[PDB]
Design a protein around this ligand. Sequence first.
Ligand SMILES: *[C@@H]1O[C@H](CO)[C@@H](O[C@@H]2O[C@H](CO)[C@@H](O)[C@H](O)[C@H]2NC(C)=O)[C@H](O)[C@H]1NC(C)=O
Lengths: 53, 53
Amino acid sequence: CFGVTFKKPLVAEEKTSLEPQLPHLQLRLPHLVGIIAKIKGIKIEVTSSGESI
Amino acid sequence: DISIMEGMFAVQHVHTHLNHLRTMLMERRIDWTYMSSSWLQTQLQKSDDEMKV
Ligand SMILES: *[C@@H]1O[C@H](CO)[C@@H](O[C@@H]2O[C@H](CO)[C@@H](O)[C@H](O)[C@H]2NC(C)=O)[C@H](O)[C@H]1NC(C)=O
């Protein structure tokens, strides 16, 4: 209109959510509980010698 | 795992200083921790207190 140009109003997103990126250390000692559980049940068997004889 | 977590501390230490430098640069100031500033005290002879200004 005349010399000036008119532009439409811009709609705005109401909310934003922040989810930052985190470094991944990738440690291996955690989630190894099964090995500890296996260590718990060694179960060495010893039979008395001389009771039979 | 301990070998990794020992080196992670240096990464965090560098991250803090780099963030401070970014803030100073966005703020139109100078971070004198990252710059020497010892060469220009001899080129133009000024006192220690006059260099702080
Ligand atoms: C939290 O644990 C999950 C599951 O172990 C990790 O997600 C895995 O990440 C690796 C590396 O990018 C991928 O290869 C796997 O496919 C992912 N698995 C799943 C189920 O998503 C996640 O990385 C861990 N978070 C941190 C910060 O270490």
